[PDB]
Design a protein around this ligand. Structure first.
Ligand SMILES: [Mg+2]
Ligand SMILES: [Mg+2]
Ligand SMILES: [Mg+2]
Ligand SMILES: [Mg+2]
Lengths: 246, 198, 212, 242, 235, 238, 230, 204, 230
């Protein structure tokens, strides 16, 4: 199967890409909200049975100490994409400049992966869409969304999957360019609540942020150039503490 | 080794190359041309190992000629030379390096100035008023350093080469059977067939 | 070994000796040092016997292929650049050969190219190669004139070899002569040096120091 | 359309091309094996298409290494292939471990290879089923392998056309002799069971072929049943056949 | 990569279609500069246009290109573009002539056309570039791998519309300030949405300021587009 | 995967269809005089606002004494040209003599032929008119190559849309006894032929003349126009 | 639907392509093979396309002790014999051992099989009768592109082969005992090839005979030398 | 035979108060024969300077290489590369050829446009990074240079003073090296501006 | 492309043969005084220079071949044929046998590791010491046959039939020349002149010679006269 599986249809559409976009559309909702001094990305831990254990499924992942990703679509396709993402972060970057890549660049690389899936012989596009949030010395904070086409674009706030439209709408009304992190968290939570069907608490939600540096999560004291990672995932407790303030 | 000298006056570049090819104990030929015209306004002279010498030259020629066709344009001497340096710089770290040294004299029709480039087998390139490879420099530089002037006419340079060729024939142990001289100027490349007596 | 080829009015003269040695041991006095590439081209042998015999025989083939492809006699220049380029491909491997590719075509006229395992290809009017070169050059240089006649020229080459066969220990046996013309080459015999030295001495008066 | 390409799962999760391969198997000669008390016997039905066949020559059973016996039913050539690879797979084991390949091990090797041919549409499964086994460091072993790459260990096993008749006979043996069965007995028995099983193909005269691998009768090596010992069983079968 | 009974390359033809559904990009070649303008596809109040780059890309300090098609397919072609640029520079120590870069990029696309079995790239490019041999040049390359140079041109949505508007207002002796205006006008009349707003535009120029010598590529910042807009009167 | 294959009727569809693309391409023609060859072509007019200065012209130099023009997919041609140019230098380098028009042709032809029996590659949508003069010779050469790989020489020939029509013009307007014995008339004839299809147009036609020993020159928009005028006159004078 | 490749078993478990290949054999001239306990003959009725051509050579020597007759797609026969020549050669060079006919058979089978299990390939479409004398006597083998090889006292293959196959199927008791005399064995070989004739009688260009045995290396008798057998 | 001493040449770089300086001689020679007196060994990609001493052909190659690399860096990251970063790049780029290296000794100098912190560094032919806040030396006269630097150098000098210091260091050190001299160039680098001055010296 | 039909034939091969039937008639006749090869040019217009049509080529001094079908496909085949004769001369210092040469060509044919079969056939005629003058026809199948005379291409059906009639084991070079001429005339849509037919022959003494238009015309004429007899 060495020929492109994704071909151009007479109307000018890339069949497989739109279909992958459909798969994405059915996935659980996830959102990202970019504040001034941070970014938050959240999703819902759709437990497929209470027998499964919630924690053992990181829907939100650290790509570099300053970049996280959340998705909507087919989890497996995401899981392998995160692996490759963390990898390329090093190969095409930390091993050449001694520092992790900047969000847009990593994002750009990830995109490149997905595009290949859109054109290489014998494969199908990834059935996922990711919201990648991060920070870097020169570009500050950013949030990006990446599609199976490979297309990516930045946002001030957005949501994908199931309740995307409703959510985008709510976000569109609450977001403004003067938002402090806690607030966007708040909004993330609020926005989350409306797309969530059943119990809404610290064990069914997953919030992660990209903010100030956490020295306590470094693992060592001594070298002062790197003050720690910016990506921090929220604890069940921390999430609930905020929920209680609904 | 063979003698390869070049001197760029004000409106042109003159190159002189010994006319002798020695293989072991005998002199095989006393009328060799150790140069190839890269483009109608650039010439390259060369000296070094038996086969590598012509092979490299011809390869470079072909490739410059091809660029000329594909683009309907004549690369500047500067371009032509950066191209050569790279090819040499590539061969020093190959399986078997071309042991070749060259001089590239060209008239840059765009800037309206003459240009002489000296590149050794290692890919070391340098732009100079006059230059030579091997030992030729040793005998002549003192003369060149002394009598050279930027505003020299084609004729003044030809005489300086003459004086240089004289020193070589006086102090150098091997008989290089004389030199073939050529000038690269705005009107092209001509061979001063009068350097046996001028 | 001593081989010469020189260009002139009537064409090309190729003359070679026929001695092969393995140290001080004379392995053969009857070797053919002229590889008949094809009816129009001549190649000489010096350096490695195998290398020349082989690659020039092969050259003989490549030329044929060319003459089928283009329906035109391959030029010596082309003929020689093939061998030459081939030889340059193996440079460093240890090929040993130095040869003259001789031919007379309409387009080029009579032509002689010196090609060697170092990758040298040269066009010239006179060439001698082998341990006995300097001796043949000596004779050639002084009696060489373009206006020579086929008969004299044959002799000149024949003699130049004689010269070398006398002084050089590694050359001798007999001289083989070849005249290359535009209609092809013509063999002009194998002349045993033994018999030839006495005859030439007697007739010419040279080699006086030798008693006989 | 789910039965045109190999690796394709149908809406019910079956690989049709495999099942078709099985049919090629069914359409073939019958063969069996009887794991006995300290060995195993193999036997197969060689159908004599014409007087022109040179008797007792087109051997069909095959040995792998020196202690494994192999017999299969279906597209004969496909069998041979399966065996050659068996041989390469066995050599490779010995070269590196010194001890000849254990039957469980060997089977799995053959298993994994066949299973592999049901993974890509560029390949067709094997049109044969193989019964094989032998003696090793700890017991006799008899296995049968189907085109899906599925295999299991047996007390007795058979395949091909006379398959049901044969299985029936084997079932009898298992219930009547849970103790075991001497190699000699199992030999004759197989001879019989083949004769019996031959009835589902009762139209052509046949040539029986038996082999065994016994820890007391053949030192653990695979040998063919020929001469006195073969005739004995041929007659033992011709007897209880009526 | 096959032929139709009519003598057309399906996938190529279809690719061009995909392209026609893409935002509009325009390149207008003035006498003292070149303009490139592009209307952005799918937006929102929340999309960050500030830190965005989706249709106007820098290839080399002297060549920029405008994109119409799959953003991702584009970036692949671009990266290699940027690379061929540098290779030439290393090899010759002179900046790569625009046509050379353009012809090279085209040749890749064509490859996908002739062999391999891979879907062509859903992209068309407008190249605005300068070089010491032909000065300013405007080029265009599409999926068939075909390329040509223009005085003014557009790609993407509503070509005939815009092409017809340009052919109307363009004149040999134009000036950048005028080409900018024209660009905006044309986009303005060929949009598929309410009204041209800064947030939906991408604008860039390649001018050779008289008070110097090297060409300067200026990719307009959001505010500047908003500014250049008021002046031209789109308000 | 084998794309170019035989059909029940003995045809290689892809090659056959390749020709169609040739027909869709503009016209190109070349007729050879007594000591020259000319090649004319009509310019494409799908959209107009072109910058003639730079746009890849239709007639290309393979070497200083050999040119090629074609009719077909413009992209597919470029490749044929490069491969030809590169082979032109290689011949020089190894045979110490530039290619003969025939050789160059046979080279270009074989390349196309190859694409007709190679997997994963579709034939070239192109036919070429190659012309020039052999080194140190004066007899003009005009050759034609098609996607099948077939090639041959022509006193005059044309390819591209409406080639049949103009071919006819030539079939009777060119006599192999008095080939256009002057640059001027050969041009005339080519123009005349070209007019029959071009449809009254100056910039519509581009004419290139090739003379012995690397003497090649394309006529400017106006030099041609002058011929056009004098032709419409030898039409209106009746 | 199920006859597009060899990688597709039909619903009844057949490989059509193989089967179709087997049918390629039936459109080739008949070739007979028969052996005694001291010789093996190959009588192959050669075929002509017009009355101005050659009667295609059906017999190929594979080693001084073995050879084969082909019926079907010649190319394939060349490929297969050549492979057979190589394997015979390998046995000689490396073990100074003559390759056992049975062994050769095992080889052809294995070779054919590979072409009946992989996408893109095609079964071989030619049958072969291989005769050869070795350490264990005279041998005759019949090879079919399905990959099946069988050792026989005699046989024939091709158009109308079934005629000679019955002759031999009855004449067995008679030829299996033609030891010490090759002429007879051949005569039988011809007599057999004639019970599958119809077009006309076997002529001097029609006939092709190959013999091999105890003190006789694989020899090809074509034309003239077979005259005494009609 | 030691490629690092065929063409000769030296480079040195120093830091001062809100500025850094990097200087180099201009001789290009072939063993004993001086061949050119105009072979600058300092290059820049934006506001970052890279001086390279060593086999001249590699000096040329490497320069061309980093330009190339620093250019794509700019296109991809939309910003100019910083000292610290270029350094890692140099190092990794050199170690990439660990078993057939470029016989060179690079020195990097520049000022990070964001922090303003002066920065210089040096490496050996395979990437071994040397990061000292004082001075870095490389070339056929490293010994001489170190000796000079160690004595002449002191911290926090002003652009004007550091200039003298580094010039002297370069100058005197070169005077004791056979393979260096024939001219010297000095770059005084400040956040905003950069001045380049050629020095007068013995032409022997 | 390697798929068998229910009849047991290779599709692309059968189709390949059809494409050949669409090509110019090629005829060769083999005598004891030589072998003649003649072809029909068939120019797609009178502007085309009749001499630039190459359908009879020299493989080597003692071997020439005529072609018919998609002629471009034949380029590689000639190249290979030439290289092989040459190579054989190099390694053995002798002339390759016509059969070997041919076989070498066919050996190339079936290599379906080139997307499709060759759409062209060849008439290889040559001479070697051991088997005298020989004529061979090579098909894209990979198969080849020796004939005494043979025609291929569009008019091959009638031509073959006529050959069958005119050929006898004793014609002279001249005779055959005429026949080829004749038969060429009988099947050519256009009238046979020296600018649209081409004759060639190969003899022991002079080898492969392609006849110059002038000589051919003299025969064409000599033919018109001998024919307008009764
Ligand atoms: Mg002597
Ligand atoms: Mg040091
Ligand atoms: Mg010093
Ligand atoms: Mg000094």
């Amino acid at each position: 199967y060495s020929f492109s599986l994704t071909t151009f249809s007479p109307s000018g559409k890339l069949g497989q890409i739109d279909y992958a976009l459909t798969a994405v559309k059915q996935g659980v909702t996830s959102l990202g909200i970019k504040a001034t001094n941070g970014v938050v990305i959240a999703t819902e831990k759709k437990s497929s049975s209470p027998l499964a254990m919630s924690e053992t499924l990181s829907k939100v992942s650290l790509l570099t100490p300053d970049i996280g990703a959340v998705y909507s679509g087919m989890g497996p396709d995401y899981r392998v994409l995160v692996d490759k993402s963390r990898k390329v972060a090093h190969t095409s970057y930390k091993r050449i400049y001694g520092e992790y890549p900047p969000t847009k660049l990593l994002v750009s690389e990830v995109a490149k992966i997905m595009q290949e899936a859109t054109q290489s012989g014998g494969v199908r596009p990834f059935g996922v869409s990711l919201l990648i949030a991060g920070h870097d010395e020169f570009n500050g904070f950013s949030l990006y969304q990446v599609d199976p086409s490979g297309s990516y674009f930045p946002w001030k706030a957005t949501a994908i999957g199931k309740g995307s439209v409703a959510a985008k709408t709510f976000l569109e009304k609450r977001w403004n360019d003067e938002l402090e992190l806690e607030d966007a968290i708040h909004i993330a939570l609020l926005t989350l609540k409306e797309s969530v069907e059943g119990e809404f608490n610290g064990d069914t939600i997953e919030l992660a942020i990209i903010g100030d540096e956490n020295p306590d999560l470094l693992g060592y004291t001594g070298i002062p150039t790197d003050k720690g990672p910016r990506f921090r995932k929220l604890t069940s407790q921390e999430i609930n503490d905020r929920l209680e303030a609904l | 080794m063979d003698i390869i000298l070049g001197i760029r006056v004000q409106d042109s570049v003159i190159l002189a190359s010994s006319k002798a090819v020695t293989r072991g104990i005998s002199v095989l030929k006393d009328s060799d041309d150790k140069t190839r015209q890269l483009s109608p306004h650039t010439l390259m002279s060369f000296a070094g190992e038996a086969g590598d010498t012509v092979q490299f030259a011809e390869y470079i020629q072909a490739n410059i000629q091809l660029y000329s066709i594909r683009e309907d344009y004549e690369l500047s001497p500067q371009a032509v030379s950066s191209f050569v340096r790279q090819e040499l710089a590539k061969s020093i770290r190959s399986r078997r390096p071309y042991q070749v040294n060259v001089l590239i004299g060209g008239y840059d029709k765009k800037k309206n100035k003459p240009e002489l480039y000296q590149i050794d087998y290692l890919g070391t390139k340098v732009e100079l008023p006059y230059g030579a490879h091997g030992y030729s420099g040793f005998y002549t530089f003192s003369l060149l350093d002394h009598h050279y002037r930027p505003d020299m006419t084609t004729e003044e340079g030809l005489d300086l080469l003459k004086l240089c060729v004289q020193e070589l024939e006086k102090r150098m142990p091997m008989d290089f059977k004389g030199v073939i001289v050529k000038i690269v100027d705005k009107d092209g490349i001509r061979q001063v067939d009068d350097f046996q007596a001028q | 070994t001593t081989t010469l080829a020189f260009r002139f009015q009537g064409g090309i003269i190729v003359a070679v000796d026929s001695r092969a040695t393995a140290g001080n041991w004379v392995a053969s006095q009857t070797v053919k040092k002229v590889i008949e590439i094809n009816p129009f081209l001549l190649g000489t042998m010096a350096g490695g016997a195998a290398d020349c015999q082989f690659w020039e025989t092969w050259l003989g083939s490549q030329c044929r292929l060319h003459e089928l492809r283009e329906k035109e006699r391959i030029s010596v220049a082309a003929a020689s650049k093939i061998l030459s380029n081939l030889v340059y491909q193996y440079k460093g491997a240890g090929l040993s050969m130095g040869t003259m590719i001789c031919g007379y075509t309409r387009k080029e006229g009579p032509t002689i190219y010196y090609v060697d395992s170092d990758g040298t290809r040269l066009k010239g009017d006179i060439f001698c190669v082998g341990s006995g070169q300097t001796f043949a050059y000596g004779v050639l240089d002084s009696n060489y004139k373009w206006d020579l006649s086929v008969e004299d020229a044959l002799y000149l080459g024949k003699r130049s070899i004689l010269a070398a066969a006398h002084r050089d220990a590694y050359s001798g046996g007999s001289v083989n002569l070849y005249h290359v013309t535009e209609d092809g080459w013509i063999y002009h015999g194998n002349h045993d040096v033994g018999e030839l030295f006495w005859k030439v001495k007697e007739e010419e008066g040279s080699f006086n120091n030798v008693i006989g | 359309g789910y039965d045109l390409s190999n690796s394709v799962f149908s809406p019910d999760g079956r690989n049709f091309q495999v099942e078709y391969a099985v049919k090629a198997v069914e359409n073939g000669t019958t063969s069996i094996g009887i794991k006995c008390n300290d060995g195993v016997v193999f036997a197969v039905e060689k159908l004599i298409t014409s007087k022109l066949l040179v008797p007792q020559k087109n051997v069909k059973i095959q040995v792998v290494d020196r202690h494994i016996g192999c017999v299969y039913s279906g597209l004969i050539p496909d069998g041979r292939h399966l065996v050659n690879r068996g041989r390469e797979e066995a050599a490779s084991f010995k070269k590196l471990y010194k001890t000849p390949i254990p039957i469980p091990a060997f089977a799995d090797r053959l298993g994994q290879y066949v299973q592999a041919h049901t993974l890509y549409n560029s390949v067709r499964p094997f049109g044969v089923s193989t019964i094989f086994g032998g003696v090793d460091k700890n017991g006799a072993h008899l296995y049968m392998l189907e085109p899906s790459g599925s295999y299991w260990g047996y007390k007795g096993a058979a395949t091909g056309k006379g398959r049901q008749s044969a299985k029936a006979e084997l079932e009898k043996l298992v219930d009547h002799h849970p103790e075991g069965l001497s190699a000699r007995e199992a030999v004759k028995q197989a001879a019989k069971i083949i004769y019996l099983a031959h009835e589902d193909n009762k139209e052509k005269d046949f040539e029986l072929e038996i082999s065994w691998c016994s820890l007391s009768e053949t030192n653990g090596l695979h040998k063919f049943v020929k001469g006195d010992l073969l005739q004995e069983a041929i007659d033992f079968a011709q007897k209880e056949i009526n | 990569t096959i032929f139709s009974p009519e003598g057309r390359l399906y996938q190529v033809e279809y690719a061009l279609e995909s392209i026609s559904h893409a935002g509009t990009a325009i390149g207008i070649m003035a006498s003292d500069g070149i303009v490139l303008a592009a209307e952005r596809k799918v937006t929102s109040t929340l999309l960050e246009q500030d830190t965005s780059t989706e249709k106007l890309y820098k290839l080399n300090d002297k060549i920029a290109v405008a994109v119409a098609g799959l953003t991702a397919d584009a970036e692949i072609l671009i990266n290699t573009a940027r690379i061929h640029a540098q290779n030439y520079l290393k090899t010759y120590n002179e900046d790569i002539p625009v046509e050379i870069l353009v012809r090279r990029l085209s040749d890749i696309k064509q490859g996908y056309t002739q062999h391999g079995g891979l879907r062509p790239f859903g992209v068309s490019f407008i190249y605005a570039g300068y070089d010491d041999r032909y000065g300013y040049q405007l080029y265009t390359s599409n999926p068939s791998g075909n390329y040509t140079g223009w005085k003014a041109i557009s790609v993407g949505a509503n070509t005939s519309a815009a092409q017809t508007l340009l052919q109307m207002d363009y004149k040999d002796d134009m000036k950048v300030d005028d080409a900018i205006e024209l660009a905006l006008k044309t986009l303005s009349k060929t949009t598929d949405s309410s009204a041209l707003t800064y947030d939906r535009l991408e604008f860039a120029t390649i001018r050779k300021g008289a008070n110097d010598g090297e060409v300067y590529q200026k990719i307009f910042k959001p505010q500047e587009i908003k500014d250049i807009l008021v002046k031209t009167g789109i308000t | 995967r084998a794309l170019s294959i035989f059909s029940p009727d003995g045809h290689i569809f892809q090659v056959e269809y390749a020709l169609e693309a040739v027909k869709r391409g503009t016209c190109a023609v070349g007729v050879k005089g007594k000591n020259c060859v000319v090649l004319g072509c009509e310019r494409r007019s799908t959209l107009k606002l072109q910058d003639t200065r730079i746009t890849p012209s239709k007639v290309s130099k393979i070497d200083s004494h050999v040119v090629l023009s074609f009719s077909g997919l413009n992209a597919d041609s470029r490749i044929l040209i490069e491969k030809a140019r590169v082979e032109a230098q290689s011949h020089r380098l190894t045979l110490e003599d530039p290619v003969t028009v025939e050789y160059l042709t046979r080279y270009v032809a074989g390349v196309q032929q190859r694409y007709t029996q190679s997997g994963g590659v579709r034939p070239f949508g192109v036919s070429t008119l190659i012309a020039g003069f052999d080194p140190r010779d004066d007899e003009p050469k005009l050759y034609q190559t098609e996607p099948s790989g077939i090639y041959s020489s022509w006193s005059a020939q044309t390819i591209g849309r409406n080639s049949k029509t103009v071919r006819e013009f030539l079939e009777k307007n060119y006599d192999r006894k008095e080939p256009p014995a002057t640059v001027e008339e050969c041009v005339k004839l080519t123009v005349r032929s070209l007019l029959e299809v071009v449809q009254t147009g100056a910039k519509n036609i581009e004419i290139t003349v090739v003379k012995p020993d690397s003497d090649i020159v394309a006529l400017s928009s106006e030099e041609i126009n002058q011929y056009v005028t004098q032709i419409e006159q030898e039409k209106q004078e009746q | 639907n199920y006859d597009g490749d060899t990688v597709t078993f039909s619903p009844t478990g057949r490989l059509f392509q193989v089967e179709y290949a087997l049918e390629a054999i039936k459109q080739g001239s008949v070739t007979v093979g028969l052996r005694s306990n001291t010789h093996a003959v190959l009588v192959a009725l050669k075929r002509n396309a017009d009355e101005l051509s050659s009667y295609q050579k059906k017999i190929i020597k594979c080693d001084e002790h073995m050879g084969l007759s082909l019926a079907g797609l010649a190319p394939d026969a060349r490929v297969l014999s050549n492979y057979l020549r190589q394997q015979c050669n390998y046995s000689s060079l490396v073990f100074n051992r003559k390759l056992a006919v049975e062994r050769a058979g095992h080889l052809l089978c294995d070779k054919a099989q590979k072409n009946t299990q992989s996408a893109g390939g095609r079964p071989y479409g030619v049958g072969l009768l291989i005769i050869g004398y070795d350490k264990s006597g005279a041998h005759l083998l019949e090879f079919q592109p399905s990959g099946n090889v069988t050792e026989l006292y005699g046989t024939a293959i091709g158009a109308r082969s079934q005629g000679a196959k019955t002759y031999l199927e009855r004449t067995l008791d008679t030829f299996i005992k033609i030891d010490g005399n090759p002429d007879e064995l051949i005569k039988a070989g011809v007599e057999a090839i004639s019970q599958s004739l119809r077009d006309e009688s076997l002529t001097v260009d029609n006939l092709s005979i190959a013999i091999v045995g105890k003190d006789t290396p694989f020899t090809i008798y074509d034309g003239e030398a077979v005259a005494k057998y009609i | 035979s030691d490629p690092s001493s065929i063409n000769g040449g030296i480079v040195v770089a120093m830091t001062g108060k809100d500025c850094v300086a990097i200087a180099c001689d201009l001789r290009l020679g072939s063993q004993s024969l001086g061949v050119s007196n105009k072979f600058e060994k300092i290059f820049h990609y934006g506001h970052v300077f890279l001086g390279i001493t060593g086999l001249a052909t590699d000096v040329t190659t490497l320069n061309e290489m980093f330009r190339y690399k620093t250019n794509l860096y700019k296109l991809k990251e939309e910003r100019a590369i910083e000292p610290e970063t270029f350094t890692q790049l140099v190092s990794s780029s050199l170690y990439e050829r660990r078993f057939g290296p470029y016989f060179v000794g690079p020195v990097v100098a520049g000022i990070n446009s964001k922090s303003g912190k002066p920065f210089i560094a040096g490496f050996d032919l395979i990437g071994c990074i040397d990061e000292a806040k004082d001075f870095i030396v490389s070339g056929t006269a490293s010994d001489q240079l170190f000796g000079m630097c160690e004595s002449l150098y002191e911290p926090n000098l002003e652009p004007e003073d550091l200039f003298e210091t580094i010039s002297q260091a370069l100058l005197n050190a070169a005077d004791r090296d056979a393979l260096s001299g024939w001219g010297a160039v000095v770059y005084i680098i400040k956040k905003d501006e950069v001045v380049k001055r050629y020095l007068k010296m013995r032409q022997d | 492309v390697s798929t068998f039909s229910p009849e047991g034939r290779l599709f692309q091969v059968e189709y390949s043969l059809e494409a050949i039937k669409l090509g110019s008639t090629a005829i060769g006749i083999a005598t004891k005084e030589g072998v003649v090869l003649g072809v029909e040019k068939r120019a797609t217009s009178p502007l085309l220079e009749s001499d630039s049509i190459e359908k009879i080529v020299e493989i080597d001094r003692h071997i020439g071949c005529a072609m018919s079908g998609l002629t471009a496909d034949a380029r590689s085949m000639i190249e290979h044929a030439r290289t092989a004769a040459v190579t054989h001369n190099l390694y053995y210092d002798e002339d390759i046998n016509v059969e070997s040469l041919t076989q070498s060509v066919c050996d190339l044919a079936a290599a379906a590791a080139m997307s499709r079969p060759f759409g062209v056939a060849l008439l290889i005629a040559g001479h070697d010491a051991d088997d005298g003058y020989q004529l061979f026809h090579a098909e894209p199948s990979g198969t080849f046959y020796r004939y005494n005379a043979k025609a291929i291409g569009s008019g091959s059906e009638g031509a073959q039939a006529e050959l069958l009639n005119e050929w006898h084991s004793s014609l002279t070079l001249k005779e055959a020349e005429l026949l080829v001429l004749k038969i060429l005339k009988q099947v050519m849509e256009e009238k046979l002149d020296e600018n649209n037919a081409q004759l060639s022959c190969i003899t022991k003494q002079d080898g492969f010679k392609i006849y110059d238009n002038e000589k051919t015309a003299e025969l064409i004429k000599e033919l018109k006269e001998k024919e307008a007899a009764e």
